[PDB]
C-alpha cells in the first residue's frame, strides 16, 4: 500500500528534529570536563549525559503532540524515559566492530570499562552492550530509529504521568507510522516491528537497573557533587 | 622582641596547610570545562571557583581551633567568607605586570574581560582589580598572606554564626600572631598591619557586590544550570 500525508509529515518532523539534535562528529564533546582513565570518568560522563538530556529535550519538543501536553506530563515523560532515549540515540555512535561508542580518537571512545570508573558494576554494563548490539543489528533506517525514540518517549506507562490516555493516543499514532513505514519501505521487515517493540521492554530493564545504581551514587555527596544540576534534576526524585 | 612557640606553631600550620592546598603551577585547571572567549566563560569559571571552594575547605580544616567548632559555625563561616578567601588566595596568580590572574598560557590567563562572559558587569569588576593591585603591592610574606586568610575566614561577624564569642577569640589570637610577626620579621611594616586589616573591609564590599550579581545569575535556570553542585550550595541561601 502506501503512507498518508499526515504520517509522512510526522516522519519529516522526527527525522529533521533528530538531525537538529545529533552531531555525527561529536564536536561539542570537548566542552565537557575531559575524561580520565574513585570514578575518574564520572565528571566527563556526567557532562556527556547532561549534554544529551538537553538534546533529548530538543527532540521531544519537536515531537508532534508532545508540546501540547502539560508541563507536568512532558516533564513526567522526560524524567522517566530520559536514560532510555540516551541509550537509543547512543546506538549511532556504537560499533559492533569494537563493541564501544566511538565519538572521537582515544579520548572520546567509550569502552565498557570507562563506564565503570563512573560508578557502575561490570555485571550491569553487560546487559547494556547486549542491547546496543541487538539494536544495532536491526540496521534501522533513520526513519525507524527516529520513530522508535518518539514511541519510547511517549510511553503512557511512566510514573508521574496524568493524562495517560492522551499520551496513549499519541504513541499509538506513532506506532502506526512505524508499522506502516516498515511495510511500505523496509524489505524483509516482516518481523522487524515486533523486534523494535521488544527493544522497548529491554530499555525498561536497563532503565530500572540504572535507577538503582544512580540512586546509590547520588546519596553519596562526594559523588553526587560531580554531577550536573540538570542530571540531578532529571534523575532526582524531588518529584 | 620575639614570637612564642604557640604562635609559631600556628604559622607552621597555616603556611603548610596553604602549601598543601595551592598549586603554583595550576596543573589541575585542565580538568575544568575549557574556557571560551551568553556567558561562555561561565562553565569554566564555575569549575575554577568550585575547585577553589574545595581548596578553601581544606585550608580551613587545618586552621587551628576551626575544626573544634560546630559543623554549623564552620559551614556558616565557609558559606559567608568563601568568595572572600577566593579573592585573597587568587592574588598569588594575579600580576600587576599585565593586570590579570595568570595560571597558564592564553587559556588559563584570566583578563578582566573573561569574568564578564561569566555574568558580571565591568563596573563591578573594577573594584576587584583595584583590590588585587592594592593587596599585591603590600608584598606580603607567605606567613602574612596565610595569616590574613585565616583571620578573614574567622570573622565573627558573619550571618549564620552562633558562638560568635569563640570565633571572636580564635580570630583575636590569629590577629596577634600577625601583628607580632610583622613586628619581629617584617621591615618597614610599621603600618602594614593596619593596611592588612583594611583589606578585609574591602573584601566585605566585594563580597556583597558579588552576592547581588550571583543572586541574579542563580535565579535564571539557564545560567544556574551551568554552576556546580558545590557552588550552588556554598553561595545558595538554602540556609
Amino acid at each position: 500500500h502506501m503512507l498518508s500525508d499526515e504520517q509522512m509529515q510526522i516522519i519529516n518532523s522526527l527525522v529533521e528534529a533528530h538531525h537538529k539534535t545529533y552531531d555525527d562528529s561529536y564536536s561539542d564533546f570537548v566542552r565537557f570536563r575531559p575524561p580520565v582513565r574513585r570514578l575518574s570518568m564520572l565528571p566527563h560522563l556526567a557532562d556527556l549525559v547532561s549534554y544529551s538530556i538537553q538534546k533529548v529535550i530538543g527532540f521531544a519538543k519537536m515531537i508532534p503532540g508532545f508540546r501540547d501536553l502539560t508541563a507536568e506530563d512532558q516533564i513526567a515523560l522526560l524524567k522517566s524515559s530520559a536514560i532510555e532515549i540516551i541509550m537509543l540515540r547512543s546506538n549511532q555512535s556504537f560499533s559492533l566492530e569494537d563493541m564501544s561508542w566511538s565519538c572521537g580518537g582515544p579520548d572520546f571512545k567509550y569502552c565498557i570499562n570507562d563506564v565503570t570508573k563512573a560508578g557502575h558494576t561490570l555485571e550491569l554494563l553487560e546487559p547494556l552492550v547486549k542491547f546496543q548490539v541487538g539494536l544495532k543489528k536491526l540496521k534501522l533506517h533513520e526513519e525507524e530509529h527516529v520513530l522508535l525514540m518518539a514511541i519510547c518517549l511517549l510511553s503512557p506507562d511512566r510514573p508521574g504521568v496524568q493524562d495517560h490516555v492522551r499520551i496513549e493516543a499519541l504513541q499509538d499514532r506513532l506506532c502506526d507510522v512505524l508499522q506502516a513505514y516498515i511495510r511500505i519501505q523496509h524489505p524483509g521487515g516482516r518481523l522487524l516491528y515486533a523486534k523494535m517493540i521488544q527493544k522497548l521492554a529491554d530499555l525498561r530493564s536497563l532503565n530500572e537497573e540504572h535507577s538503582k545504581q544512580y540512586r546509590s551514587l547520588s546519596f553519596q555527596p562526594e559523588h553526587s557533587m560531580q554531577l550536573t544540576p540538570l542530571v540531578l534534576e532529571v534523575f532526582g526524585s524531588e518529584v | 622582641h620575639m614570637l612564642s612557640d604557640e604562635q609559631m606553631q600556628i604559622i607552621n600550620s597555616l603556611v603548610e596547610a596553604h602549601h598543601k592546598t595551592y598549586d603554583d603551577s595550576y596543573s589541575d585547571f585542565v580538568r575544568f570545562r575549557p574556557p571560551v572567549r551568553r556567558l561562555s566563560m561561565l562553565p569554566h569559571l564555575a569549575d575554577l571557583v568550585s575547585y577553589s571552594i574545595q581548596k578553601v575547605i581544606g585550608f580551613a580544616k587545618m586552621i587551628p581551633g576551626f575544626r573544634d567548632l560546630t559543623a554549623e559555625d564552620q559551614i556558616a563561616l565557609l558559606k559567608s567568607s568563601a568568595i572572600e578567601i577566593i579573592m585573597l588566595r587568587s592574588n598569588q596568580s594575579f600580576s600587576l605586570e599585565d593586570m590579570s590572574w595568570s595560571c597558564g598560557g592564553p587559556d588559563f590567563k584570566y583578563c578582566i574581560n573573561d569574568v564578564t562572559k561569566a555574568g558580571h558587569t565591568l563596573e563591578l569588576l573594577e573594584p576587584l582589580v583595584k583590590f588585587q593591585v592594592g593587596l599585591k603591592k603590600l608584598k606580603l610574606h607567605e606567613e602574612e598572606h596565610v595569616l590574613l586568610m585565616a583571620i578573614c575566614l574567622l570573622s565573627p561577624d558573619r550571618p549564620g554564626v552562633q558562638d560568635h564569642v569563640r570565633i571572636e577569640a580564635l580570630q583575636d589570637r590569629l590577629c596577634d600572631v600577625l601583628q607580632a610577626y610583622i613586628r619581629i620579621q617584617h621591615p618597614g611594616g610599621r603600618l602594614l598591619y593596619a593596611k592588612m586589616i583594611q583589606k578585609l573591609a574591602d573584601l566585605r564590599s566585594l563580597n556583597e557586590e558579588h552576592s547581588k550579581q550571583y543572586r541574579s545569575l542563580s535565579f535564571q535556570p539557564e545560567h544556574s544550570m551551568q554552576l556546580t553542585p558545590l557552588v550552588l550550595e556554598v553561595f545558595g541561601s538554602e540556609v
Binding site: 538537553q54 529535550i57 519538543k61 508540546r67 508541563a71 512532558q74 516533564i75 522526560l78 524524567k79 544540576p229 540538570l230 534534576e233 532529571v234 524531588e238 518529584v239 | 535556570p221 539557564e222 544556574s224 544550570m225
Partner: peptide, 10 residues
Amino acid sequence: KHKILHRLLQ
C-alpha cells in the same frame, strides 16, 4: 520544582 526542565521546555 524542576526549575531547569521547565526553562528548557521553554
